[PDB]
Amino acid sequence: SMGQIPVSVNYFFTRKCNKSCGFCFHTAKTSHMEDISRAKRGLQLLQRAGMKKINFAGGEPFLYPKFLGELVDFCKEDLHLESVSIITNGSLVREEWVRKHAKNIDILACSCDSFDENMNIEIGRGTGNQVEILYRIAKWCRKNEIKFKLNTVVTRLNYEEDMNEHIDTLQPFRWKVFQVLIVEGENDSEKTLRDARRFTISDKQFEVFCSKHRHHKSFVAEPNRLMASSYLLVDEYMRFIDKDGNKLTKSILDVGVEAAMKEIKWDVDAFQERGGVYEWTKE
């Protein structure tokens, strides 16, 4: 027998966030964060088990820019990872932080579900000109030789939107296009912190969006079948999460990577199918 090799891992180090997206599948269930020593040790355990790429997620990572900055630097300088990535809502990213940590960040991804403010307000992404923020982040990325990535959630409300003029200007190297996903115990009812049900779309509606946009090299479509089990999910206590099966392991800090990963389903075929291995190191 052999355990799977956790080549590319998402560490959701916080569940705290400053926005209220109605579909969110990683909700504010707790404010617990690991101490920096513990986080470093778990990231080291992952590296030692074959991790090559780390994505810092949440929650909103830039609620904790000093902590994030320290783990980013550690991952590149001390663990020598191939790829250090972050996904952010963009609101709290500041230029001087990007300048300070750019040498250690391969990829910075920003979420944008719409270029229409009223749509952002409706979906819970909030008010204000978030397009000028996205453009600003992209500019900071390009100035500081970080690869700029865009993540978009496709829902019942926005699936007819045409983003091509923006894609042709921003030119992200990688553009995730997610079908909105229901996750049991996260966003699946009126009792969870979010109720994503009103956002769901059919395969046909998802294709409306995909067909308009799939000509871009950057375009990466992820229908539900390609998100359900294709990621490695490490939570705020460094436990693995199985979001498809609604399971949670013991912390890697207590039982190690291999024992924890045995408990979760990671569909490597789906991982490969969606292009989960790619040129993730900056050039």
Ligand SMILES: Nc1ccn([C@@H]2O[C@H](COP(=O)(O)OP(=O)(O)OP(=O)(O)O)[C@@H](O)[C@H]2O)c(=O)n1
């Ligand atoms: N069932 C799932 C599937 C994905 N995710 C999370 O959704 C986000 C998707 O962001 P993405 O940019 O696709 O993550 P990366 O791992 O950086 O993607 P890639 O390496 O393919 O660029 C990640 O935080 C991932 O952990 C999740 O919470 N539940």
Ligand SMILES: C[S@@+](CC[C@H](N)C(=O)[O-])C[C@H]1O[C@@H](n2cnc3c(N)ncnc32)[C@H](O)[C@@H]1O
């Ligand atoms: C949970 S967020 C965490 C990082 C940051 N707060 C942000 O929104 O970018 C990570 C990614 O998951 C996406 N996402 C959130 N809920 C989702 C859902 N139900 N289905 C699909 N993708 C989702 C987000 O839009 C984002 O691109």
Ligand code: SF4
């Ligand atoms: S998807 Fe929205 S609510 Fe969820 S963590 Fe990101 S910004 Fe916060």
Ligand SMILES: [Cl-]
């Ligand atoms: Cl780029």
